[PDB]
Amino acid sequence: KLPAPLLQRTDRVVYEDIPGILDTVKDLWGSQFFISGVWSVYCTFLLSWFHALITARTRLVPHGFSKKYYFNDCDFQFASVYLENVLATNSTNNIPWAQVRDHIATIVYGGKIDEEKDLEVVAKLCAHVFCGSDNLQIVPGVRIPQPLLQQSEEEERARLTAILSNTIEPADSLSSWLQLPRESILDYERLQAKEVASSTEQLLQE
Amino acid sequence: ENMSIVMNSQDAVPFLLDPSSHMITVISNYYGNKTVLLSFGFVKRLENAVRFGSVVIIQDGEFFPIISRLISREFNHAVTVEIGDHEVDVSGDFKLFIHSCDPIPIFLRSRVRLVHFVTNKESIETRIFDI
Amino acid sequence: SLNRIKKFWKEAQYEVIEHSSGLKLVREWDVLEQACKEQDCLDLESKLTKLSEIQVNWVEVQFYWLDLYGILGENLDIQNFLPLETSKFKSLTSEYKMITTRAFQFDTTLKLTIDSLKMIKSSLSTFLERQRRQFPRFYFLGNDDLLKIIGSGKHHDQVSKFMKKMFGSIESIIFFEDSITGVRSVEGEVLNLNEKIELKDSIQAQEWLNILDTEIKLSVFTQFRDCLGQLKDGTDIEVVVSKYIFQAILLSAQVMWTELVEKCLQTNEFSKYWKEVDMKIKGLLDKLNKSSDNVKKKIEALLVEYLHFNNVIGQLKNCSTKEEARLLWAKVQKFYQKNDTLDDLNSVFISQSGYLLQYKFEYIGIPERLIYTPLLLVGFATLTDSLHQKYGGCFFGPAGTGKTETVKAFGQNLGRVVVVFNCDDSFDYQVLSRLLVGITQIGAWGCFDEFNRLDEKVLSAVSANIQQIQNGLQVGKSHITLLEEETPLSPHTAVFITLNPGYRSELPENLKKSFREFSMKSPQSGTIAEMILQIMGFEDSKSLASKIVHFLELLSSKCSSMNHYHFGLRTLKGVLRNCSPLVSEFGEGEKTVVESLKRVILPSLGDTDELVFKDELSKIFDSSKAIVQCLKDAGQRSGFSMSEEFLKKCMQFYYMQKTQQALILVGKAGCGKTATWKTVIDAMAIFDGHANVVYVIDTKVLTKESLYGSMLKATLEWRDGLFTSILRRVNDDITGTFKNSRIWVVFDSDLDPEYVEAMNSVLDDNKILTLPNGERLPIPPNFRILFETDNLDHTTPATITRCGLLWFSTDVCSISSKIDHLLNKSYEALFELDKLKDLISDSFDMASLTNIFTCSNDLVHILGVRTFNKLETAVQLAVHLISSYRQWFQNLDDKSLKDVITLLIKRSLLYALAGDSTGESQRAFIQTINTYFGHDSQELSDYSTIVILSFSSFCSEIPSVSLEAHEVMRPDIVIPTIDTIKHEKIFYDLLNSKRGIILCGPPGSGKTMIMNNALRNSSLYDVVGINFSKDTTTEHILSALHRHTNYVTGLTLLPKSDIKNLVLFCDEINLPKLDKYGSQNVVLFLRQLMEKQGFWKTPENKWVTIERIHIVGACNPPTDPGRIPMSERFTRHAAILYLGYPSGKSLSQIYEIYYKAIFKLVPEFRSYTEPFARASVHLYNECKARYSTGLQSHYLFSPRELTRLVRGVYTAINTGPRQTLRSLIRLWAYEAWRIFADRLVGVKEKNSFEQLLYETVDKYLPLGNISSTSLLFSGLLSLDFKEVNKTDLVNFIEERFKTFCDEELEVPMVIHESMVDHILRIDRALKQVQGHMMLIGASRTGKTILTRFVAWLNGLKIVQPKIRHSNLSDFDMILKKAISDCSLKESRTCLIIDESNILETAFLERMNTLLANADIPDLFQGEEYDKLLNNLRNKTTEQELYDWFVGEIAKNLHVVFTICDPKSSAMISSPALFNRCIINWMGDWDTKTMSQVANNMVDVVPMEFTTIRDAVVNILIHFDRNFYQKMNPRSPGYFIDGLRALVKLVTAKYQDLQENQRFVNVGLEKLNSLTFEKERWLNTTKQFSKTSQELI
Ligand SMILES: Nc1ncnc2c1ncn2[C@@H]1O[C@H](COP(=O)(O)OP(=O)(O)OP(=O)(O)O)[C@@H](O)[C@H]1O
Ligand SMILES: Nc1ncnc2c1ncn2[C@@H]1O[C@H](COP(=O)(O)OP(=O)(O)O)[C@@H](O)[C@H]1O
Ligand SMILES: Nc1ncnc2c1ncn2[C@@H]1O[C@H](COP(=O)(O)OP(=O)(O)O)[C@@H](O)[C@H]1O
Ligand SMILES: Nc1ncnc2c1ncn2[C@@H]1O[C@H](COP(=O)(O)OP(=O)(O)O)[C@@H](O)[C@H]1O
Ligand SMILES: [Mg+2]
Known part of the structure; x- marks a missing residue:
């Protein structure tokens, strides 16, 4: 609680940034400059997509999670450094995807989470993003092919940015892209409109 | 009309219940250097101010009893006021005020000229009508 | 004022109270500072400011010289430490001596002195700073420990005691022939240094401590290297367990395990190394079964680690693929060692989840090794992740979930000691930041245990420091700038935080951005218990651990939600720790676990909880007489009886104090706690053979300053408290008694939070006491604390498991068993003895007594004491009655003796069980008693009494005393009646029976009266009567006992007399209010005197035995306002009697005796005494029955009103003329109206009283108008109290009012009929004996002015106290001056007290006692009392002198109370204020009074010029009614001020208008071009009338 006299003789604004998934992926990708081969850049791309997806899923309080968490840039830095260290100590290109999956789900992102339900939510999203399979359908529209073993990192950054530019964000991105049922986000919209209408009723009967 | 009621009271000591501390500032500006501000050796400085003949303003009205003779105007003429344990002369220019900023014993309530400053929906109506 | 200040400074001196020489010392700082707080004025102000600076220098110079004499006046090594520093302290000593000499025998000199004192303190501060920079492990200590260590230069001692504080895991230094060969760990382990540390006389402390610390690190490394090479050479671990310290074997085994598991993980081979590890575990277990204690600890810790190794290898073997095996191996801590690095101490690194950390080779000892659970390894992983980027590891979750222990285990595995901040309110900022900087500079790890328990300011202040540390670590900074110094920042430090959010707050934002939080809510209590049981040697450990965890879960889920229930992991580990001494007897199996669960958990459970425990124990689990026999023998020695419950609780307490050093016994009062632990202690003394010394200390009666000890605000000299004194006396053991005897300290009172905050560290694992002076007192093993409570409402959950808890859910006896024990004890208190004992014992036939007790519990008892606790009163009363009548028992038949014994037992039962009930309930109970014994025995009736031996009755004893006229x-x-004699007889029996009495009853029932009648006519007892108040202390009782008791050795308290026992009458014991923690000092003090017969002296700590002092009480029922119920632990020690209002027959008898006494003055109507008595009694009875307290708070009536009526009629007859029958009747009616109907609500109620009085006269006294306004009585217009005429009365009072207003004050009062009637009434009430006023009237109704006028007319003198910043000292000084003037001058006083001057209820209680008596005893004591007696002797038997003093005060004192609003509400219902002060209802003004006042005041203002007056008065009164009904009495202050302002404004405005009219007339006459002026003048003259009407 800030003091009342400080909050009185001032002009107050309340801000709301875009919850768009693709905008957050683009911001994370543009803020990153990658440097270790092509796989570090590929894993940074995967981590940016995962962080944007989990931050978008956080905003839906009753259905996306069970509470309101706050995953931020420091958590992204910790995960990125863990991927860099995993790629550095394992240069035989047999990447321990189980290691990064469990470490990100349980220690990096799931450290602050006490309830179990949110923990297998994070575990499911980690399993989807960091599956390490040949074909990766992150969302039902776009795919991220793995880097090939005859090129450099600049062309990989260009290719992933080109994949970003091709992507279009539909209006139902809060349920199709987050692997949520449509009835769940419909119920969330119903609850927010219900609390708004009920509060207007209480403010109107006075 | 609040100021008129305050300064048209020659028999009872006026009361200034002002939460914004604006009345104390305006009366200090009005009186200049003669304003002696106190709150609840305060008895000794009250006696010295009474002997000198200086206007005294006392804050914290909710914490009001040693000034009972002065608030009731019970003087002995031979004009002498017996404050504490010693009779003290009065120069005649002495005026007393009481201030409070927390919107009280019944003796304090029914012995002064209470003046109140408050804003409400009626004040909102009056202000917007004036505008 | 200047002369007084100069004289005070010239008289300023010093007191010789110090030790040795030192400085001369000063006391009473506060008075001197309060006294201290144009050229002459400027000089005086400069002198005062300089004096304040000098006193600041003075207080600071003894504040510094405390430590300076501690380290310099008794230790020359500090002052001779360094050469330049030696010269500096020599100059210090020279300056000290020179200022001492000039203080015994200057302004600039003393300014230079304080400047030099600041300089030398700064030099000492930087010297300690340099000492701390040389050895940064000094910086964990306080200043005094540093001074002691640096003074231990060539002594090599006392630096071996603080190394637990400095090093964390070192107990002591070992030294042989002035050389060091190692250190001792806390667990007793010895570390063998590689080479001896050679020591000479020319050595510095920090130098050899630096060598010792680096050599400790190198020696731990060397032992690790030797053990690692030996284990690499194929040598088994079973031979090297006993060779090196635990840390070396730990690290070597971990390195070998990591290397071997990686080598076997490169292929698919795990069974071989798994079998090797399992064989090592089995060999270690076999060696543990037959090893010494240090080897036991070593093998226990190695077994923790080897079970971890076995678990990891078993997890790795079951992996299907190599990828998941590599995943599982990457999650555990991995230990390696470097090879290329020639640096020894940085050669070992530790890998977890990919990242790497460093082993630091610090010595740790054998810590309690945490069991390796997967959650523990995940906590290790997240701590590693936080440390790898120089962040901070944070932990949050519920309380007691394994956070601080996880941080400590991480530190232990990484080869270092984690210094733990036990964060609470005790840690202030300077020590916390100091130990933070120590952890920074060393490189140690600081775990902030319970970080959410800090205060807000300290949390922010240290959050800034932790943020600075973390920001320095993150960017690789070298120096951090905190605490105004650029201290070094070692890059190996860290900060951990464990907290509990919302229990509280979360991590602050500035620390939230630098830390990495983690949630670890659920420990695995299954695998922890399994590994602990496997270590302890149980054959079946996994299934047993599962059973224990399941059973604890069922107890946590099924039992009740009591606060003291903890079924988590700490309780489980306590059970497991307690299993092993039971393993030594029962064996390794299920029986040991079951019996340990019974010994640990079952004492803390209730009754239904006990049934749940037994049911679940039978469902889950399948399933010494020497101490039982000794307990039975000790109980039969002590008189107790071994019931099954009592024996069970005794065995539980004995087996539970076997292990726990401090127990809590909880149970309802009277359940048997003290008997339990006294029996157990006696049996242990008989069985073991050790002597036992016991001490009982009630906690709440002594304050904490008296319990522990505190400084002096002027001298700073430590004084030992009681607990510190007894602990020091058992620590020293001067005589040698306390070397082979168990010592107990029983805190036989209620737990208190603020008291146990200083008890927690005493109860901590350190067994150390924290004192303000710095002394640390150890606790021996045989120093066991005991607690004895009845509730745990304010006990924190930190001490329910730290201290042992034993729960007494029910009584340990039947009623018959306590009856038998009480009988035997009372017999032992005493050829006739054996037959007497047999008769008293067998006359208690339990078959009828059971029905009697079950029929006595149901009746309505006031101050409800349980049926089990009336047995002491009943048995002791019966035994004392028979022992009093034993003299004439040898010459009576068995039938008559049996009947007499039966009657006395019936009387004891009736006055014990239902002595605390109403009259009708007493009749019902005596009917039950007569029925259940049978009709063959003697029937005890309502009035049966035994006279010497025959049946008698109380009705034939009462004396018909004839007091004269002037004893009313x-x-x-006291007028004796049947009830008075009955109550005095039962009071004598209960007093002589060595029992306390409580006299509960309504106000005016006759509690104090029957009390002082009983022990004023007695030659065997004396009274020290006390009236209690809201603010009562223990010292009040001692002050009351000061003049009646003497100290004899003081180890014993005896009365000053030699033949009469002393009785401590304590009236109104409900007044002592509860403290902030729900307890009262005075009633616990009373409980201490009545139960234990003595008390602890507060300045000397000695047991002052009570021999011949009794305690009785008399208090109103607790349902009344302003009263607080007392603890039953006290009231169970006092027999409770109930005193209701006397019946109509007794009332009529008493008041016909009073009317005979009053009509001896007027003998012509001597035959009419009885109808007057029935008149008064019937009038009061109707005034009570028809008028209840639901109408007003002052609708209370008692016999006090009848006595006041009799006194008023007496003073009116005495001060009146010759009286006819009609004059007598009208005088009685007028007096009844003035006493009773001074408070009735309306005119309707007063008319109801008038018709009641008319009916009373017509029924009893066979009449003119007798209203309040028709019986106009006065004595001002004549020489006697008679009916005077209204015209002359009003003329006289108006002339005297004119004299008053022209002589004393210029008050513009308005005279009216209500004012005349009320000044008449107040003059009447001030014309009596003991006249005081409770004037109920609204503000500005003329009450104070009327009182002053009446006091002026009657010749009284006026005093009005100046009551801010005034207290009882000034109030009593003013009252002493007033009473001295009254005694030495016969000057009748009118002491004015307003409701604005009653600030404290202590003033009210002072007047309350003053009006209970006609004086107060404790106002005059000592020198003032002697001076008063001398003045009485000069003006005029101590009893006769005090009686005359009481009489002259009661005749010559009139204090008045002015109240507007009826804190002051309890004054009205207070009984002793209700005694003589007359409550006058002034009333708020009505329409008639308002109109009359307005008409009288505005009549002197010309207004009839525009009738007007009545119309405007009606307007004003009706608008006042509308205002007060559209906006409690309604004040006329607004009304009177409005009328006054209107009067002055009309006069001034009419004068101004007259001047304007005169000027206009002059102008018109001068003017008489002109046509316009004439027209304007005509228009003005036409409009003048409307102008005047508009003006008004
Ligand atoms: N084994 C026993 N046989 C008979 N009477 C017993 C036995 N144990 C206790 N009593 C009786 O119980 C009474 C209760 O006194 P006790 O000192 O045991 O109470 P307590 O538990 O300390 O109570 P409190 O909390 O009020 O101090 C004793 O006075 C004694 O007469
Ligand atoms: N390996 C282990 N893992 C978790 N807890 C353990 C382990 N071994 C013992 N414990 C028990 O867990 C408890 C941890 O409580 P603690 O962490 O001190 O709570 P807090 O730090 O919140 O006060 C200790 O009492 C200890 O007896
Ligand atoms: N038997 C009696 N003889 C004479 N007076 C009595 C008797 N019983 C009651 N009274 C009157 O009742 C009043 C009792 O008041 P008191 O006992 O002092 O009240 P409290 O018990 O509250 O102190 C006394 O004024 C006393 O005169
Ligand atoms: N009936 C009255 N007529 C005139 N003045 C009054 C009257 N009652 C009160 N006052 C004013 O009030 C002052 C004192 O009132 P006081 O007797 O103290 O009333 P209270 O005891 O109820 O406070 C006087 O100086 C007087 O001027
Ligand atoms: Mg009394």
């Missing part, structure tokens, strides 16, 4: 003024004259 005396308030202590």
